[PDB]
Amino acid sequence: QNNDALSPAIRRLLAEHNLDASAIKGTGVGGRLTREDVEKWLAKA
């Protein structure tokens, strides 16, 4: 219910790139996916 793993904006980004959240790992402030993470993944895909 109350999860802060992924952000609302990012969900749009990941949805745009056509990627999968489960196929990525967030390194935010305590395990929170960030745009930087998506970038590193996009480049390694």
Side-chain angles (χ1 to χ4, degrees):
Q1 274 177 25
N2 288 77
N3 56 284
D4 212 68
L6 259 162
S7 339
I10 303 181
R11 276 232 77 79
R12 304 214 269 282
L13 181 62
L14 278 154
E16 296 256 316
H17 291 270
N18 244 109
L19 321 170
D20 196 302
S22 219
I24 313 180
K25 289 172 202 101
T27 27
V29 188
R32 327 218 222 197
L33 199 44
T34 32
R35 182 175 49 270
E36 307 235 320
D37 291 322
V38 184
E39 277 237 329
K40 298 309 218 89
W41 188 251
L42 281 158
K44 200 112 207 96

